[PDB]
């Protein structure tokens, strides 16, 4: 109930409500029906301020939804550069896999986000890592025809 | 987008290599037809 009001506020990007509900002992790792923490919602909708305020109050940085996707998966996929850095600084698993074997590098690479691909690599992303179909980030870049990305992943 | 149409998979060869649509065709946004070409005082134009 209290943790549900936090989920709505984390999504809606209300900076005041997140901090004020946290003061009243709101569950930072409250899960919605699909298994999304406030850190999933802030990472998805691109609310940088709330990602930092949630992590400050000991939010599970490697919380995974019912299909194994983490806030880093969402940040990397929807091109939120600052949030990828903030999450990786707070000890996010750079080589995290969802049920499909898809990593944040796979998603960033697929959506052509060159600046985020470089940050994930810097924090120690496994280039040679495969999904369930045996595809690397290099395979994705070749198929998508991104030569700027292909030369970075070699 | 043209990028997405380009990476349409036509077939996979015996040696594992893929034939994409951009390998047999040029992908670009272009007119439904190219019959009508308008000009306003010699300058390229469209109109209604």
From Swiss-Prot, chain B:
Disruption phenotype: Loss of susceptibility to contact-dependent growth inhibition (CDI); inhibiting cells still contact the target. Induction: Positively regulated by MarA, Rob and SoxS transcriptional regulators (at protein level). It is found in: Cell inner membrane. Belongs to the resistance-nodulation-cell division (RND) (TC 2.A.6) family. Homotrimer, with large domains that extend into the periplasm, interacts with AcrA and TolC. AcrA may be required to stably link this protein and TolC. Interacts with AcrZ. Part of the AcrA-AcrB-AcrZ-TolC efflux pump. AcrA-AcrB-AcrZ-TolC is a drug efflux protein complex with broad substrate specificity that uses the proton motive force to export substrates. This is Multidrug efflux pump subunit AcrB. It comes from Escherichia coli (strain K12). The lineage of its organism: Bacteria, Pseudomonadati, Pseudomonadota, Gammaproteobacteria, Enterobacterales. The chain holds residues 242 to 289 of 1049 of the full protein.
């Amino acid at each position: 109930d209290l943790g549900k009001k936090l989920l709505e506020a984390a999504r809606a990007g209300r900076d005041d409500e997140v901090r004020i509900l946290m003061a009243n002992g709101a569950d930072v790792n409250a899960a919605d029906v699909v298994g999304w923490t406030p850190l999933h919602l802030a990472a998805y909708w691109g609310h940088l301020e709330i990602v930092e305020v949630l992590l400050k109050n000991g939010a599970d940085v490697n919380a995974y939804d019912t299909l194994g996707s983490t806030p880093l998966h969402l940040a990397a996929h929807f091109g939120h550069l600052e949030i990828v850095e903030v999450l990786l600084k707070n000890g996010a698993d750079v080589n995290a896999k969802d049920d499909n074997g898809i990593t944040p590098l796979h998603l960033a690479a697929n959506r052509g986000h060159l600046e985020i691909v470089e940050v994930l690599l810097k924090y120690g992303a496994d280039v040679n890592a495969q999904d369930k179909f045996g595809k690397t980030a290099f395979d994705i870049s070749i198929n998508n025809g991104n030569e700027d990305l292909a030369e970075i992943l070699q | 987008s043209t990028e997405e149409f380009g990476k349409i998979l036509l077939k996979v060869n015996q040696d594992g290599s893929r034939v994409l649509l951009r390998d047999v065709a040029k992908i670009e946004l272009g007119g439904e037809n190219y019959d009508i070409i308008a000009e306003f005082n010699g300058q390229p134009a469209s109109g209604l």
